[PDB]
Amino acid sequence: QQNELTRNGAFHLNKENYMVTANDEFLLGYQVDPSSGEVSSYEPQPIN
């Protein structure tokens, strides 16, 4: 719920293999299954 909107895409990985920004702020994304097609669950969560 506590998320902020941005535009630059300078992303990288941290030790936990989460795609974060320069400030170590975790990105959010949609959950789709390995066999799914379109978005399954619309609630965002960090990309692994």
Partner: protein
């Protein structure tokens, strides 16, 4: 004529290479954001050759 293997080179990969801290002489060390040093051989799994 004794052909014997003397060892093999160790290869180290960290999950977050951007987070490695910079020492002198083109050298780095592991830090808390760089992850833990993953010790592996070459040409195995995700490692290069």
């Amino acid at each position: 004529g004794e052909n014997v293997t003397l060892g093999r080179v160790a290869l180290v990969r960290v999950p977050n290479e951007q987070g490695l801290d910079k020492k002198g002489g083109t050298q780095w060390d592991s830090t808390q954001f760089s992850g833990d040093k993953i010790w592996g051989e070459s040409n195995k799994g995700s490692f290069g050759t």
